Write a protein that binds this ligand. Structure first.
Ligand SMILES: [Ca+2]
Ligand SMILES: [Ca+2]
Ligand SMILES: [Ca+2]
Ligand SMILES: [Mg+2]
Ligand SMILES: [Mg+2]
Ligand SMILES: [Mg+2]
Lengths: 604, 604, 604
């Protein structure tokens, strides 16, 4: 009774808040301590969990304004008893349907004791049976928690209700969680996902470690799932999962949107980064109206593989994007030391993914994979894929491959070493005839660029649309036209028309060229105007060379070395000065001079 | 007296350092505990604050080499009493003017009890009345502090002195703070800013949350203000403020410089990212000499709006840059679900901002805004704006708009969906005639590119300056000139001069073209040389076609199908072989042959 | 004996785990507490270190499954006694050769008491004598540790064994450490490095501060050394070191590979970011087979200098890359306010570095440095250097300089202010004749671009390889060829061949041009075809203008204004319609008509 008096004095000091041991907890790894937790938690004081293994016969419910802190991971341990049945998460907020506010959890281990159920078992339904489930809550800070041997997830942030709602694409579920911080947490040995979000927003997941699920279904390190939005993940690590970071939805739910990945390291996952929207992948399916806005940077992928046979032996990826609009990837390094682990495609952008950008990519060691980067589109309006500053080190028989359905591709500054690849084919390959391409460099690929079946092995620069260079202003240029090295006032307004080295000169002539000229105009077809001033060619095949103030208006009518004449004859070459003065008549075989025609001349 | 004996033994154990309760603190929410804090703090031991609300009748002064740690946010709470007057911050370093060293603060709530003053009140002047003020200090670590109901700022890092110094642009204030770490802190209900820096350097602000100011002036989540430099912000969140992150100075102070934003999430702020230097915005004002170097990446902006009417109903922005030189933005996602919240410009670069770069941008939902990105310049030398890899999803009647004063613009890989926009106009619009542009893709915009009033709807590629392609080396090329498909030794050295498909061929001829030639030279004006070897055209309108070793030196003198002749006649077509052998004289209407002229011929 | 009874009750409560004071530790700064630490650590309980300076006469050995936590930095202090000899780290895992698992260290100061040895002393050999040495361990979390006055390193993660292994390039040492987290740690006053990794993998180093080594050799803030791989550093700061972050190996070891830097701030280091592989730098040395894959972003460098004379007065750098393949840098800001601190090169890519990319760079104040960015290559196959979106503010007499051995360079969107530079030369300078360049803007540089000795001051756009614009598909284009403004079916298959404004027209003619034509073909040399339909030029210097269904097969044979003729004469101009009808014979000086030749004509 002396020790009990001393303890009473210590308890009253409340150095940490109130200890659970003050309310009767033993933390001996045997005794049911649930009532002690419930009493401390309802007391209104911040609650402290000291050293021990605190056994619990039912889930710990958290009310609003809870502070629960432990002595640390693997120091304060909270654990389900062997006798606990099915249906409850180990720790969760009390108001399951409308939520709670202001919950601060730090520094302990949650052990779900999934072992007690035998092997091969996951959550019984919906969000039930995670180690930590946060439903419809606002202002939740989760820090330095280790979640171990979990039946469903390690840590799950979701909307109100025990079930996950499936309300269809383009919806938002009632009672989201909001303002959540998950930092320095670890999740392992889970049945589904390590750390996951559903139908919630304004979430930061920082410096966490999720690894080694028990099962081999859709078991992801970080799963930003159905209904999520406005989430930042940064400096996390995943290991040995299906997806490292998955961002998705099911077919009957809205995809996660506006998600930022500010650095991540994926170790030996199947698909390190896996962004998708089930049910919105097929050509005959609707486009997702929710799968939009992902910005990911400083992404690391190491030895992706499917040794464990996740998802019925799904093929490995460094990055897989499907369904999503507006994905921006900057700074990606994929590395492997075993060429047989991933043999299909290292990076894929397919299945209705659109308006995606990849910049600053290094892929090394994928020497038995068919494709480094493989993009397939749907001939959708306003689509684009931009791939720039990519370096491939023995990665991909096709380094960058662009398939069907892609009309707008920009591929710039790609370099590749192919010497160590098993049967390399081409650094860059394109199905469409009009990719935009520049800055290719390679060694050990038999072909550098293959564009719609034509090989380019000595450098390539391809640009699309109306073209203009070395010209500070101009009028209209047709998409099959150009103006170069010209001063103001020029136009090339029809298919196959162009102006070079001229001033104030215009062509509306299909199949035409004006060069070295001023104030000249071509307006027929098959027109040529060269080194001329105030020249007009206005009939089919009409042309002028070294002419001033002259108009060629005849069919196949050419004017040479002339000033101030207008000609109209068919198949005639003419010259003159204020009046026509000679003619070579190809039609009738006549030669005519205004003055004399003579032989026996000398030029001195 | 037994309990007091037990307590004495516990106190002597010093398990945390020394508790404030050992020095008399009650932490009961009523009793003035200031003397207990002062005694513990002056004792030389690390100081611990256990569970309680510790009331204080004056500010807590911190000397050098202080360790002050609490039981945690909302566990250890430190609070001004209702009776406290004006002028003091709740917690600050003792040496206000020359500073202190080595201060380590962790795990407690600071409650400024601004309520006690009535509503609508902010700091009485300068840096006075923040929850935490650090002045002229070196080596300060601030961790897991919650700052609540603050009169001025939540956390303020500043130079020595109670007042903020206003020494003019280009200055550095004496006694900066240096080496500061602010991590996992929260600031809310403040009068000015949540977390702010002044006249200080070498600062990391990490994983903090600043939200919901009391007032509606320049009330920012994170304000990197007057005199700041060498600051990193990473993985912070701001919500419901004027600026999410503001980087600035007032007119009579140096702007913050060399600031890095390594990821941020802004939720429902007015201007999520707002970089400016007051007094250095107008065309007739001086350029800031201090506003330089901002690198920002992985920036998230959500539902920017001005529902609260901050700053006299300032218009919302995802990003606003003014005054600053050298701003690099990479990976920006702006998202809204309410088109009426922001109706002017989503991203603006204006008011003397220069040498700015935006890459990897996704803007979605801004379907009633006039401009997606709007850039205005000042025709300043060495200026540039680079915009690349941008995707717009129903954001901006003008997607990317370039206004006046901009001579150097690069706009590449821009795509836009305009179908859901209220009256869309153009994906890209340019006032200047010479933007550099490529890779535009759109649906639902009536015009794709409008360049100085001319529409391009079928693809566009525009480049500036001297142009060269498919040519590995050359001599000089004029800015209104080009060389293409040529081997070494070519030049096109004057306005409107160009060489195609040639070797060792040079033109200094204004309005000229050399093609398909070798060792040829044009040096008059209006010169054409085609399919020739060793040809020279050296007079106005002189030309040669299919000629070898020949020189055309006459006015409008054309040589055809010839070898080894030099001609000088005006308005003459000539041919020959070592000597001139025929002539078509346009001037006088004469035709001359050296040998015979005959009719009645056949060609067999 | 009453106080001892109370203490016994407290000890039994185990509020933190077990305190070292329970096992006899005094923490008085004098008494040897090693046996108390050893007893607590072997007890199986988590171990707590309360307030005190705990002196230790030998290193603290950590077994597997250790939890050791203190009252905090500068609160719980662990220190070597003055009498301790040489050879031991202060704290290390017990199994030096095969390693330990599951070690969790938090919240204390390690004071190595290097002072006790006199000044100028470092580790006696290999990994011996760091404050904290982790050898061959799995699952180690190191948090909130301050490492002070260290003999060797502050914190060292290494493989098994006391010595560092030197097994040669391309090897992997046995018994790596794996899964290591180092967060919020500080290292200072060390003999070698602050925080370093060797022969280990899956490591995150976050929010740490390494500064001010005692010595002036290879003394780095963060050194990712020999054998390291799969490491993320983020939001760390280094100050006053040789390298801020060094990534390297020695000559007889494999370089660190697949390293991510997700933001860093370097303050007054010599080489802020220094990536190298000793022994693999010289032209006559082997290429490193291990130095691959570095992705670094949001890098800050401030006032780099060598005031302390590190490494025999090595010259300062913002960034130095050598030996490494596949380095991607995005978002770099270098800033200085003292132009005399760094006078050679701000950023260097040299000494066998290859396939490197720099994007989004701002360098300001380096106004007495010779080079802003200086790249040297080795004429290696598949090499590339990409430099884009760079802004220089009075930094570098040569802003961007490309030296010898570089065949593939892309330099885009570079702008520079040179007005405040001491004798500026050129914004961009290139030794090679064929750099790819666009988007240059400058003020205050006397030359904008100098390309192999030729100056371009008015804008430049240079592209390499086969060129095509405003043409949606084509057949083959030679690398010294082009097709522009054309529709399908065109080819330009040989050197110096090109097609403009045409349809289904092909040239295999060296030095040729087809323009404004359809179904035409050039297959000789020196061929010109203009404004023609179904025209063939198949002999040297043959040409056709305004011709339909005609073939020019003569030497220097030109056809004009014709239909349906085939000509074969040498030095002849011909025209006709189904048959040849006139000829101008340059060879013999004859003029021939099929019908009449007449003078005295008029054209009305
Ligand atoms: Ca899952
Ligand atoms: Ca403010
Ligand atoms: Ca070293
Ligand atoms: Mg899920
Ligand atoms: Mg301010
Ligand atoms: Mg080393």
């Amino acid at each position: 009774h002396f020790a009990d008096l001393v303890i009473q004095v210590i308890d009253e000091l409340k150095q940490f808040g109130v200890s659970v041991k003050t309310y009767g907890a033993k933390g001996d790894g045997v005794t049911d301590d649930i009532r002690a937790f419930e009493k401390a938690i309802e007391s209104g004081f911040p609650v402290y969990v000291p050293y021990g293994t605190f056994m619990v016969s039912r889930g710990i419910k958290l009310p609003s304004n809870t502070v629960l802190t432990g002595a640390g991971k693997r120091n304060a341990v909270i654990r389900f008893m062997d006798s606990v049945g099915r249906g409850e998460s180990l720790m969760y907020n009390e108001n399951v349907t409308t939520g709670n506010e202001n919950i601060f959890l730090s520094s302990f281990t949650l052990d779900g004791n999934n072992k007690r159920l035998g092997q091969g078992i996951s959550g019984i339904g919906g969000s039930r049976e995670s180690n930590l489930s946060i439903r419809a809550c606002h202002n939740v800070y989760i820090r330095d928690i280790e979640a171990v041997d979990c039946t469903l997830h390690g840590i799950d942030i979701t909307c109100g209700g025990l079930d996950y709602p499936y309300l269809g694409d383009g919806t938002t579920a009632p009672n989201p969680s909001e303002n959540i911080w998950i930092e320095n947490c670890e999740a392992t040995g889970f049945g589904d996902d390590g750390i996951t979000t559903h139908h919630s927003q304004y979430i930061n997941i920082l410096n966490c470690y999720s690894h080694d699920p028990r099962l081999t279904a859709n078991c992801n390190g970080f799963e930003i799932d159905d209904g999520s939005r406005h989430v930042v993940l940064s400096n996390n690590r995943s290991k040995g999962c299906y997806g490292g970071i998955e961002i998705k939805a099911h077919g009957d739910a809205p995809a996660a949107y506006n998600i930022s990945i500010n650095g991540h390291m994926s170790v030996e996952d199947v698909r390190s980064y896996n962004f998708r929207h089930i049910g919105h992948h097929a050509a005959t399916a609707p486009q997702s109206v929710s799968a939009k806005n992902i910005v990911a940077s400083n992404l690391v992928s190491i030895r992706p593989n499917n040794k464990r046979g996740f998802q019925d032996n799904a093929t490995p990826r460094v990055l897989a994007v499907s369904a999503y609009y507006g994905v921006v990837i900057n700074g990606l390094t994929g590395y492997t030391d075993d060429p047989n682990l991933l043999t299909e495609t290292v990076v894929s952008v397919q299945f209705r993914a659109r308006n995606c950008s990849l910049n600053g990519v290094v892929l090394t060691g994928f020497s038995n994979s068919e494709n480094g980067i493989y993009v397939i589109g749907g001939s959708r309006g306003g689509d684009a894929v931009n791939i720039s500053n990519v370096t491939l080190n023995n990665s991909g028989r096709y380094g960058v491959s662009i398939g069907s359905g892609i009309e707008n591709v920009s591929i710039t500054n790609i370099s590749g070493i192919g010497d160590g690849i098993n049967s390399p084919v081409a650094l860059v390959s394109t199905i469409n005839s009009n990719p935009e391409i520049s800055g290719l460099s390679s060694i050990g690929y038999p072909t550098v660029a293959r564009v719609a079946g034509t090989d380019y092995n000595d450098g390539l620069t391809l640009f699309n649309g109306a073209f203009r260079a070395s010209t500070t202003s101009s009028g209209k240029i047709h998409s099959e036209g150009f103006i170069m090295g010209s001063t103001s006032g020029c136009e090339a307004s029809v298919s196959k028309s162009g102006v070079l080295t001229s001033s104030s000169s215009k062509t509306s002539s299909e199949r035409s060229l004006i060069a070295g000229s001023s104030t000249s105009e071509a307006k027929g077809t098959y027109n040529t105007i060269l080194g001329s001033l105030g020249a007009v060619a206005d009939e089919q095949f009409a042309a002028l060379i070294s002419a001033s103030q002259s108009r060629a208006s005849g069919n196949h009518n050419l004017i040479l070395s002339s000033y101030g004449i207008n000609t109209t004859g068919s198949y005639k070459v003419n010259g003159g000065f204020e009046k026509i003065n000679w003619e070579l008549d190809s039609l009738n075989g006549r030669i005519k001079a205004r003055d004399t025609v003579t032989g026996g001349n000398t030029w001195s």
